[model samples]
Target: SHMGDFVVVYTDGCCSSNRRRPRAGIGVYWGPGHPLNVGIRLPGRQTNQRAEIHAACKAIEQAKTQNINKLVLYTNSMFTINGITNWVQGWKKNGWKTSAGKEVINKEDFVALERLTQGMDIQWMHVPGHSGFIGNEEADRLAREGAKQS
Candidate 1:
């Protein structure tokens, strides 16, 4: 029931502002020929970080549901990549606290993404935002559309 060599997913998140109470959206695209493309408007106030984490979580959830064992997850947010691939373990070990002892932001999404990716082969990639890469562009558009709905 696997897709192919691997499931390729491009994800993005959009926030209306950097200020407090930012409205946000998440977008995920599993390539043009794939069926898992989607946009999501996050509930309640959100930050870009949360939106990014949500997109990763959603992508992982979708892939897991499809029984995809290998994945190439592309994201424009470096923070998302770093958090999931690196910082999350430290945060978890520290009880989801930063070096300053502050509670980690978007802890729920980080944990959810980590949990969803367990036992899966996921290659996290960082793509330049606003570039002409077709998959990334489509995901960006979807994210903008979701943001508009928020």
Candidate 2:
């Protein structure tokens, strides 16, 4: 908005910390607006998988606050794509348990994503580790920078 206190976009996640306890980070970039871009130093272990999952959560929730119903979410992790698209339904039916009764990793994150995406139009795209997409490239940069924030 004008004089925007409101925050808000496309997103990605990353993990880093060589010679240091690893850290996870996420990035949501909606445009060139530096203030508009979202970067977060994630909590918990510096796990690549969870950081990807966490990025989805943060981006979707940020969309909610913006009252955005249509989401074109691009992600580097196929795990994130599959977890939300196909796995979550079965996961939910099994009481957040995998078919084998093992607790689903990032169960809460999946649940939150499901809750936020209900009734919304969302499309998740895959960005292989070194995608040609400029948006994702920048998103990766944001996540990398944020990871260093640890």
Candidate 3:
């Protein structure tokens, strides 16, 4: 919680009825009772995948606003990592198409997240969800609450 040259933050996404009609929200958690902690229902199509990506994007944007150069980001979604660290390179070469000739979903947010990382030093950490990690659990709670509230 204490910023020691590097800011630590956690992000999570919640989507109820994900397989059918979905309502998704995102959570970006800084520390206990931190003023920058954020949770809100997403504005567009609600999907678990989109929620996760947007949460990360939101966190990065916050960091940008704070002028943070060193960041340690924790999230429960591997999709977020994959979208930035792995899939994006291939997608760009393939003209944003998948190898299976399918369109890439969530491309806009993925690009935004990648753009945010350009000059900053970020350590992406993927933690198991609901596995007794305090930050992850807290963010998940905020996300679920957000899904219900907005």
Candidate 4:
């Protein structure tokens, strides 16, 4: 069997309360011959959506550090997916307002994430959570652990 040479990352975030204590988790699966996977809990307090964004952000950051040019990210948050892909155009035109014509939430995270993803041929995949996906399960665990630690 020919092994794949790409990395697959899954990320999740949690919040006990909005604008309160929040935690983010990132799980990375990579390696050529041996195939290793590890999950890391990140420091900081943010929203669940921010945590979702954090997952992709962390993956891209690592990819850049490792000099990895190709990547696929699977996330459980549609808010994040839509915000990153479909809604960006309207958001930019509307000055990042919501459909109700109100200002969008977490504008800084969205802006930073958008800037970070520029010029990278990255693909986003929506994964159903709690469906027994290995990476998703691991990411959830890491996220909870990260939150507890904080």
Query: Could you give the C-alpha RMSD of every candidate to the true structure, in order shown?
Result: 2.6, 4.9, 1.7, 3.6
Which model, 3 or 4, shows the larger TM-score? Answer: 3
Q: What is the full ranking by lDDT, best candidate first?
A: 3, 1, 2, 4
lDDT-superior candidate, 1 or 4: 1
Q: How close is candidate 3 to the true structure, as a TM-score?
A: 0.91
lDDT of 3: 0.86
**lDDT tens per residue, model 3, 17-101:** 9877688989999988888888888768889888998888888889988899899989979999888888999988998997689
> Model 1, 1-150: lDDT tens per residue?
123787788899888775755879889987765677888886665888888888888888898888888999889889989998899978878799987889987787788888888899998989973667788888877888788664
Give lDDT for model 1: 0.83
Could you tally the backbone clashes for each prediction? 0, 0, 0, 0
What is candidate 4's CA lDDT for residue 44? 58
Off by over 4 Å in 4: 1-6, 17-45
Best by lDDT: 3
**How would you encode candidate 2's per-residue C-alpha lDDT over 25-93 as one tens digit per residue?**
888777676555777897776788778888888877777777777777777789889998999888878
Could you say which candidate leads in TM-score?
3
Q: List the global CA lDDT of all models.
A: 0.83, 0.76, 0.86, 0.68
Which 10 successive residues of model 2 have the least lDDT summed?
1-10
Candidate 2 local distance difference test against the native = 0.76
